[PDB]
Structures are given as structure tokens and as C-alpha cells.
Amino acid sequence: TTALVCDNGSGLVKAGFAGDDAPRAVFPSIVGRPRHQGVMVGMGQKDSYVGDEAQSKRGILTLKYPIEHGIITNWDDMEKIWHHTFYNELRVAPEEHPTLLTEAPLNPKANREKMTQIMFETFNVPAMYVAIQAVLSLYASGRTTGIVLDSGDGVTHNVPIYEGYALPHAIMRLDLAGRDLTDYLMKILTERGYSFVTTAEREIVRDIKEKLCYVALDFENEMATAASSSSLEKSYELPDGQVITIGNERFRCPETLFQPSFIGMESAGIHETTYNSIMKCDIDIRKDLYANNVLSGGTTMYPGIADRMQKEITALAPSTMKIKIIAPPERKYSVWIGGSILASLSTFQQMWISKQEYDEAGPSIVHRKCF
Amino acid sequence: TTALVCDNGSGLVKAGFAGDDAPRAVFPSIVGRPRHQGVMVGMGQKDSYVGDEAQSKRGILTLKYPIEHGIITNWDDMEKIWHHTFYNELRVAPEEHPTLLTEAPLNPKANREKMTQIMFETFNVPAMYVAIQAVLSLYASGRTTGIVLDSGDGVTHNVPIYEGYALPHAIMRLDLAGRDLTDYLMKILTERGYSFVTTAEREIVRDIKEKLCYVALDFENEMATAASSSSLEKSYELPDGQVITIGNERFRCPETLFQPSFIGMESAGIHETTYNSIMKCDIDIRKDLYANNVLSGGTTMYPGIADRMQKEITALAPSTMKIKIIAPPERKYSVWIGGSILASLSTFQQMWISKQEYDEAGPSIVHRKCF
Amino acid sequence: LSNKKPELLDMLLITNNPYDYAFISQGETTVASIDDAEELMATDNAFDVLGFTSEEKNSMYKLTGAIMHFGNMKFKLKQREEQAEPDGTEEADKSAYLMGLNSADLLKGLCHPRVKVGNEYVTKGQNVQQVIYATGALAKAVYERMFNWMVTRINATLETKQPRQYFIGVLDIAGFEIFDFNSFEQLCINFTNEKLQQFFNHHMFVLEQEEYKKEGIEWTFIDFGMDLQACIDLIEKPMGIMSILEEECMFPKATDMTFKAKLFDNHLGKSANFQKPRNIKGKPEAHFSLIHYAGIVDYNIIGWLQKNKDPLNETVVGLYQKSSLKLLSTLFANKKGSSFQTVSALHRENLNKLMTNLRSTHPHFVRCIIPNETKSPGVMDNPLVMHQLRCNGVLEGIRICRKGFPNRILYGDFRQRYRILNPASRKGAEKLLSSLDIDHNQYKFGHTKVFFKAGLLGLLEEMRDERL
Numbered sequence A, B: 001t002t003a004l005v006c007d008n009g010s011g012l013v014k015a016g017f018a019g020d021d022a023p024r025a026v027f028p029s030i031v032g033r034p035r036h037q038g039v040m041v042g043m044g045q046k047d048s049y050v051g052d053e054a055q056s057k058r059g060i061l062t063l064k065y066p067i068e069h070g071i072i073t074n075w076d077d078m079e080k081i082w083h084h085t086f087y088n089e090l091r092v093a094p095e096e097h098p099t100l101l102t103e104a105p106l107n108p109k110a111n112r113e114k115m116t117q118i119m120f121e122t123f124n125v126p127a128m129y130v131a132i133q134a135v136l137s138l139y140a141s142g143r144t145t146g147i148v149l150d151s152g153d154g155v156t157h158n159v160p161i162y163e164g165y166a167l168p169h170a171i172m173r174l175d176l177a178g179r180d181l182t183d184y185l186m187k188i189l190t191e192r193g194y195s196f197v198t199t200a201e202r203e204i205v206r207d208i209k210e211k212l213c214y215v216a217l218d219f220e221n222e223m224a225t226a227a228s229s230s231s232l233e234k235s236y237e238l239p240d241g242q243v244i245t246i247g248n249e250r251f252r253c254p255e256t257l258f259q260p261s262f263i264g265m266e267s268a269g270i271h272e273t274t275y276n277s278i279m280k281c282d283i284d285i286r287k288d289l290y291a292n293n294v295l296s297g298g299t300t301m302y303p304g305i306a307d308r309m310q311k312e313i314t315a316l317a318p319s320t321m322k323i324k325i326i327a328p329p330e331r332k333y334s335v336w337i338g339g340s341i342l343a344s345l346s347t348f349q350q351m352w353i354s355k356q357e358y359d360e361a362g363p364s365i366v367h368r369k370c371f
Numbered sequence C: 001l002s003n004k005k006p007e008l009l010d011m012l013l014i015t016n017n018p019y020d021y022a023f024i025s026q027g028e029t030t031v032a033s034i035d036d037a038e039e040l041m042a043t044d045n046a047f048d049v050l051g052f053t054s055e056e057k058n059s060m061y062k063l064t065g066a067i068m069h070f071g072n073m074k075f076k077l078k079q080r081e082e083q084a085e086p087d088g089t090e091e092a093d094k095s096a097y098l099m100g101l102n103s104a105d106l107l108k109g110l111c112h113p114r115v116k117v118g119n120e121y122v123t124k125g126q127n128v129q130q131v132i133y134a135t136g137a138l139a140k141a142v143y144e145r146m147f148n149w150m151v152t153r154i155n156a157t158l159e160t161k162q163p164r165q166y167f168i169g170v171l172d173i174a175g176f177e178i179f180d181f182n183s184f185e186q187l188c189i190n191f192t193n194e195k196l197q198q199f200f201n202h203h204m205f206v207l208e209q210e211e212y213k214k215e216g217i218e219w220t221f222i223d224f225g226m227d228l229q230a231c232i233d234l235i236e237k238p239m240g241i242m243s244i245l246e247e248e249c250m251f252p253k254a255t256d257m258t259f260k261a262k263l264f265d266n267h268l269g270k271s272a273n274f275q276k277p278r279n280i281k282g283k284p285e286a287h288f289s290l291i292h293y294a295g296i297v298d299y300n301i302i303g304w305l306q307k308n309k310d311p312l313n314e315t316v317v318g319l320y321q322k323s324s325l326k327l328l329s330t331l332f333a334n335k336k337g338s339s340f341q342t343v344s345a346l347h348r349e350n351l352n353k354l355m356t357n358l359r360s361t362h363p364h365f366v367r368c369i370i371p372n373e374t375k376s377p378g379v380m381d382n383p384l385v386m387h388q389l390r391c392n393g394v395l396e397g398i399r400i401c402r403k404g405f406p407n408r409i410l411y412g413d414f415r416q417r418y419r420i421l422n423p424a425s426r427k428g429a430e431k432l433l434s435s436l437d438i439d440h441n442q443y444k445f446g447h448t449k450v451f452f453k454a455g456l457l458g459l460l461e462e463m464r465d466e467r468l
């Protein structure tokens, strides 16, 4: 029945049919509106640009993210995003395609209830389902145990799984993510003479972060090296010229994931939250969790993050146990691959929330035996 | 035809065929249920893990012993254990194989009756028999007189036998056994700061007890030595590193057998109950009983238990009397060897409880002349 | 592998030892009662004097030599990483030279496949098992495509430009093959023959219903398709054996024991056809049994997962499309994902295509059996013929025919011939048959053909001869 798979995520919307190993449509989750008056008569601009077109018109619009950290904060933008994804990108009729939606752990139940209400009453999908990001990521990695770290653009969480049995009491959620890294990158680039304030320059700073940032294995030694030598400086091409040279700010920005005190946060780094989450589990499964540390999410794609995290965990873990971190090249699209794999399974066909069952059980059907 | 010799015991089920030299299948008698929920769909975990399989999943299962002190309390779990033993560990169909069961002395008649009923109905064995765990242990030692002490994991009984004639009035049963020692080790390990509370950690504490514990010849002298010296401290590696060192708690755990007041018990020690049972018998058979003290069972495997027992009983016994304690290397499997020897006898072929006899005489036939 | 054609061995870089190739050595190296040299001479003589030339024959020999060569690379896993890297960069060079490809490019494509996500491209990590499955899938796919291309070339040589109208089809497919070690291939053959038997039963029911409508009376108007659809549903329908195997191929950590456990949890007791295996005559081992149309068949589970996975690499296909050889013709065209490809799915779709092609033509069934296991016509083994007759369903077919009223005779001929049963038009025939002490429930009156139960005509005619 070629069921549909979607991944709202945060900052990027990726969707496609089940049974594939790659999303067919990937575009930012951005809705923008014009802020100037417009003098040309007859062209008839539309009142809202959604998706990839807002990036093309980035210099005349005001970009807004409908989701802050996983939770939707502007719903009308979410119906607009879903309509765009279903019609302009995939060109499909959602009246005969079951839709699988991926949602983060530890979120308000009203969020899932409203997602199901929108799917059933606005688009009239025959069936739907809501799943956890980490479980799908572990599907895509071809594993059955191991703590998985999923750091995207909205929220970073660790979910430990052993033999297909979750450990909910050890699930930890941290709101530090890529958006905070971009904000800190602006706050640390403002000291060189480069000021990025508008929402359009958000995208430029994000591109600089994606292209020129890396995680250093050591911090103090790297700072000493950069403070004397000029081998760490690189130049970037702004969309109009005036090349900018970034020095130690390229590895100082991702250090927030390991030193969250940079942005005033109270919590500890991911290298410590993962160790704590492992230690909250039982003593008989800590070996497999130590030896099957799985990474996913776009934020975990910094060159050198895996080595630094492995070094930190080995410093924390007992010296008599091996530490292995799995970082496949396709971390960013792992969740969608896992979702497609799950939707392609035939034993999953009886776990859909049907239209009749939803009508019988109301919006509270999500938290019942059907998940 | 061939006969099966089983030994349910308490915490270790060992079985095989009659005429063999050693048991073919030995595995713990535990049943485990998944206490979590399970997020991965399609795997389809079984709802009950039985035998040594439950030992591999100690981190996602809760372990329950169907036998607490000799007697069977949960009967569905025992039926599952028997089905697993007959169909997976041995892979033999029991419809054409007589079975020889064992049980401890001084048990409720309901236990034996229900055992016989289950064996005759659920598995439809052609014949069955129940034997005392002490007579088999005496068979395996190549003796015909002398007391035997079958200190297992659930119960500790001392059955005196002279010239093949048992003395039912001198049989003494004590419930202090390996499980109580493991619980006391749990209690005294908190003294050093190590907390073992979960049922999975029971297996770990049992492993330390088996590996490191030993019986001291003199309790007070060893107390003085351990307090001043440090040569008694040994380290054990937990399944996740963080090695732990146990000192004075090494010989304190098996001292409960000789000092039952440690765990709040009122009864006297094993050495004193043995002497009391010796003097409970006649006066013309005390010499052979003194000279033929036989030890068996898993709990009697502590290094140096025989020397301490001999010293204590010699202190109790008259000075002009000779004392010998028989402790073969294979104390743990002595009962099964004796059962195999008994089932291999030609004269025993006329003592089986036939199916027709059971159908004619009801479940109460077992307490009749057909023991 | 025969040494009488040294040119092929020389250009194919073959050591003439079948044990040096894992694709061939794992089976039987050689057998008696055959001389493959004569078969090679016949085949290459046919290839030479035919529609096509010999250069493409040399290209096909090169392709089959490369297929033989793929069973040699090692693909050692890298240290401290799950990625796989090659070790024996010698057979890879030979294969690249045979296909005209770049050895470095082929190794990079095998170790690091590239997939298009959104509008960009990303690389995928693959360990030794994944690349082994990919190269096996590539080998089997290229072999099948080469065979299909050869068949198409022979066909294109064969035809002539005369107008074609309402062709006549001839088909030959092996029957219900049953051994003591039934496996996945035997299951596929049994499923195909099951579908063919279903088609035959449906055609027979259609013919019987047509006769009933011709005579205007329907006797037991129940379609025989449902009498046989149970096995097809057990095999083809979702939650069936094929679907369970397909979904187990994609599960993260799936083994054969898990496959058997899921089969038992899904079908043991739910469906009548599925049942526990039986231990008769000291057979090696069985895992599950089905009550097929020919009887109880027990299969084996081990090896199904490895031989069902068909992960077709795409970057290697793109490399194939850029070769200086016939690879462009073979791979001219190449939507379910590449990884989500299985042998069972392709077999099912091919069977469906064959069935939908055969439905449009009126069938004609011919059954062929071997009387003797040896070549001596004098002696013929009774159990073998019994098993083959049971498998072919000839007895089943005749019983289906005789279940209704197969005995039909013409009224006037009956009146003018069988009146001698008790010697001394519709109404006359009815009076004659009712005057011979015949129960009214046994026969059925019509207009042109009279329906008679089996045995009535035989008894009527055998007593008629006595009265002569």
C-alpha cells in the first residue's frame, strides 16, 4: 500500500515512501513572510513562502521556525509545512497513504494529540503512527542493543536499549542542539568585527558552522596552538564578497556540547550525560551499552566529535573495558532509514491507528495500547 | 529400555540417563519474565525464559525460584522447568522412559502427591519413583553404613543409616543452606559500601561466595589475624569493572553454618546437630557412624569445611574415639551418581510405580509400600 | 573448465582447477556419466554458425570467467572501524580487466556505495557481510541478465516477417520435485507447481460449469479453487512463509532459529496446513511440514536467509554502464529500494507474470513420467511411479472428474442400443430407463446429454452382454 514516511525533525523536513533507503524530499522547515511594501503592480506575490523557496527569497523575507525544541509553537505554519510536503514536493494524495511520524522523547502529550488530530481531520489519512527517533535510529544501524545519542537541531537525547527492551528511567534529554551552537557562533563572531543580526544572516552563520567547524581532541593545547600559529585560520565567501577569516572560533563553537557553561547552561556535556545514562542501567548490561555506542543526528557530524567523545568516555569508564563508538557516514538520514525499514515490515501492519479506531476512541488513542 | 535420573534440588537442576557416570545437563532452576515493555516490534520475544537462558538476560529479567526450601511453591514454573529439561536439555521424548525423582526428607505429602500426579498426567511417563536424597548419596560413596550430610542450597538434612537399615527417628532437618548464606553475604557486603539488592545481583553475590569464601579453622584467631594483617584481602572483578575487595567478610559467610545465631536462627550448628543425631541412635552402632561421616551437596564445597567439622566433632566426641570424614571431590554430583546406580540395578526393576497401578490406586499409592 | 579449448582458459586467466573458485568448489567438482567437452563443442558450434558472430561469444565467455573470478576477494574489516577494505587486489584487477572497468573505481564503489538523498549524494559504510551480499547479488544479477540477453538475441535471429496471429504456446516446467533434503529452491518449485495445479483445477471447473450451463442443470456448483487456495495463502499471502522470510531478511539481528521461532509463533495451530515436522525413516533433520497437494512435505531452514537477500549495489551498476563491453546492453535499464530486494519477491512477480500470460490462452495439459530410474525399460519401480502419479494429480484429476456425473450418453443411441439389458424421444428414453428397475435418484434427465452417476453405465452394459 506504499505507506508514507515523514520526519518533521527540527530545522529540516525529510519525507518519502517506505521501502526506500533515501528521502525523496529534504528542505528546511522554514516559513517566511515579506516585510517590505512592494511597488511593482501585477506580479501578485503570495502572502507566504514555505520551504526551499524561502531560502531563495531569503533577502526579502523574515524566516521563522515553527518549532523551537521539538515542540511545535506555531501550528498554522505546521499545517502549511505538511501541505507543502504532501503536495509540492511528493505530489501525492494523502487519502490513501498511511503516514508514519517521528517524534522526540519526553514531550507534552498535547503535541502528539494535535498531530493525530491534524493528520486525521485535515488530511484524512487512512492510518498513522508516531514513533521515537532513537528506536528508528537503532533500526537503521542494524543493532539490537546499545545506547544511542541523537543530537539534531532542536534537542539532544540518549535512549538506552538492550535486546529490544527500553530503559525509560535512564532516558536523558538535553535541549542543547545546533541552534544554540549557531547562536553562540554569532555571539563569538561579534568579537572579530562581524555582526549577524537578521534572520537571513542566521542561515549564513549556519552555513559557516556547517562548512568550517570541527571538534578538537584537546582544548587547552589547541588554544595554545591557535594563539601562536596562524595555521588554523580559514577564509569564507559571503554571498557578496568581503572575505572573513575565522581563527579559534571554528573549534570553540562545538565545545559547547562538551562545555555547556559557555552559554550559561547548568547541565554537563554529552560525554558525561551518556556515561550517566549508561550507569543508571543495570550492571549486567553495561558492557553491551559501552561497546555499542551509536551516534545519529545532523549535529553529530562535526569532524572529530567521535574521537573526542570516545576519549572522554574512556577517561570516565573503567580501564578494563573497551569503548567503541559507531559513526556511520549517514548519521543525518539514519532516522528516516530506520523509519522506512520499520514501515516496510509486515508485522507492523496491525499496529496502525485506523480511522475507525480513532473515531471510536477519540484523540486520546495515542497513549493506549496502540502507541 | 532406559531410565531417566533427575534431581530437581533447589537452584540447580541436573538430569541424565541411568547408567551414565555424570549428569548430562546441569543448569540453574530459575524462570525469568521481562519486567520492561519492549520498544522494538517484530522481534517477538518470548514471555518466559527458563533455565540457563535466563542467566544470559539477567539485565532485563526478574528471576524467581520455584523451590524455596525443598518444597515446590510455584507449580506452573516447575512444570515449565520439567518441560524444558525433557525437551531441550536432553531432547528425549518421555512417553517411553521411566523417571527417578528425588526429594528431601520430612516434606509435606502434598508435594510428593502433586509431583506424582504431574509426572503421570502432563508427561505420561510409563513409570516413576521418588527416592530420598541421602540414600542415593550413600550409594554413590560405595558404603552401607555411616551417616550422610546432604547440605544443598535449600535444605540441610542428616540421615543416619546402619547396615542398610535407616533410622527414621534420628533424622534431623535444618533449613539453613546456601541461599541463606548468599543473603547473609548480601547483608554483610553493605558493611563495605557495596549494595546488591536486585535479583540479578543475587547471582553475582553467589558467584563471589562460590569463588572467594572459605571456612576458617578458628574464628577468633582469624578475626585477630584479619584485623591486624592484610594478607586475607582479595579482589573480585564485577561484570562492568570497578573491582571490589573483600577481607573479613570472606570466612564470615560460611560461619553461619556453625554459628546459626548470625542470621537470627535459634538452632545449633551443623557440627552439633551431627553429634546430636549420632547420640540419638543406638549405642552398638555409634562406632561405625563416627568412623563413616559422609559429606555431600554443593554447600559442603567450601575449602577447609571438612577439617573444621572434624575438629569440632572430635572436641564433642570422646577422646578414645576415631573420627573420619569422607569428602570426595564430586560432592556436588554425588546424589545423581547414586540415583543412576540405583536405577541401573536389576532388582530395582520391580519397584517402579506402573501407570496401571497408579490408575488403580490413586495418587496415594506413592506413600504405600511402593515408596 | 575443460582443457580442450586453451584460448578461453588463456584469455580468462583460469588455473583449470575448479577447487580454486569458491562459487563452484562448494558443490560437486565433477561427475561421471557425462563428457562436458562434447557439450562445449556442440554449444560453441551452435554459437558460431548462427545469427550472431563470435566476438560476442568471446565477450560472454569473458563475463562468465569474471563471474567465476568474483569468488576470490577477502574484504578485511578495518581496525577500530566497521568499514571493510579489500586485501587481495589481484583478482579484482583481473575482473576489472575482464569487464574493462577500473579496479580502483570498482573497489571504491563496492566498499563505499553512494546514495542520493534529497538533491545531494552521500556515502554509506558497509562491513564485510554487506559487501559480500552485494557482490553475490551483482554476480547472480549479471548472470541472469546475460542469459536473458542471449535468449533475446536467439529470438531476434529466429523470427521471420510473416504476419503473426493467434500463436500456439508450448511450455515445459519441472513438477512436484521432492527429495529428503527439501530447501528454499524446492519450496519455490513446489509453489510454482501449486499455482499450475490451481490453474488446472480452475480450468476443469470452468469446463464443468460450461457443460452444466449447456445442459441447464448445475451439480455441486462449488469452485475447486478454494479447495486448494489454503496452501497458496499459507505461502503467498501476507503473514505467510515468504512474507515472514522477507521481513526477517531486513531485521537488524535475525538468524535462522529466529525465523523458525516466528514461523511457529505465527502459523503453528493457526492454519491447518502448517504442522510440526515428522521423524520417519531416519531423515537427517526437518523444521516444519506442509500438507501439499501431493502429500506431507518437510523442509529445512538453514541457509534461507543468506540465499534470499539480494542487495543490488547501484554505483557498481553505474560503473557497469560505462564499460567498453556488452555490459551496456545487459544493464540498459536499471520504485522499491535496492536493499529491499529479495529472490522470493522476484520469483513471485515472475510467477504472476507467467500466470497472467497463461490465463489468456486455452490450456492443454500433458503429463510426462519416467517409468524406471535406470535406462532399462524392462523393470519399472512401483513406489517411484506411485509418487510421480500422486504428484502429477492424474488420480486427483480423474477423481475430480468422477465426483460429478461424468457418464453422459446420447438419448437415441441409448434407446437403440441398451434396450437389450432386459429384453422382452425424451419420453421414450425416460420410460425405457424407468422400466429397467433403476432408482430415480441415481440419474438426471436433460435434453441432449443425460447425466449418469459413475458405475451405473458399467453395470447396465455388463448385464446387457449376459442377456445376449
Ligand SMILES: Nc1ncnc2c1ncn2[C@@H]1O[C@H](COP(=O)(O)OP(=O)(O)O)[C@@H](O)[C@H]1O
Binding pocket: A008, A009, A010, A011, A012, A013, A151, A152, A153, A154, A178, A179, A206, A209, A210, A211, A213, A297, A298, A299, A301, A302, A332
Ligand atoms: N556537516 C555538518 N557539520 C556540522 N553541523 C551540521 C552538519 N550538517 C548538519 N549540521 C547541523 O545539524 C542540523 C540539522 O539537524 P537535523 O539532522 O535536520 O535534525 P532533525 O533531523 O531532527 O531535523 C543543522 O542545524 C546543522 O546546524
Ligand SMILES: Nc1ncnc2c1ncn2[C@@H]1O[C@H](COP(=O)(O)OP(=O)(O)O)[C@@H](O)[C@H]1O
Binding pocket: B008, B009, B010, B011, B012, B013, B151, B152, B153, B154, B155, B178, B179, B206, B209, B210, B211, B297, B298, B299, B301, B302, B332
Ligand atoms: N565451591 C563452592 N563453594 C561454596 N558454595 C558452593 C560451591 N559450589 C556450589 N556452591 C553452592 O551450592 C549450591 C548448589 O547446591 P546443589 O548441590 O545444587 O543443591 P541441590 O542438590 O538442592 O540442587 C549453589 O547455590 C552454590 O551457592
Ligand SMILES: [Mg+2]
Binding pocket: A009, A010, A133, A150, A151, A152, A153, A297, A298, A335
Ligand atoms: Mg533528529
Ligand SMILES: [Mg+2]
Binding pocket: B009, B010, B133, B150, B151, B152, B153, B297, B335
Ligand atoms: Mg541436593
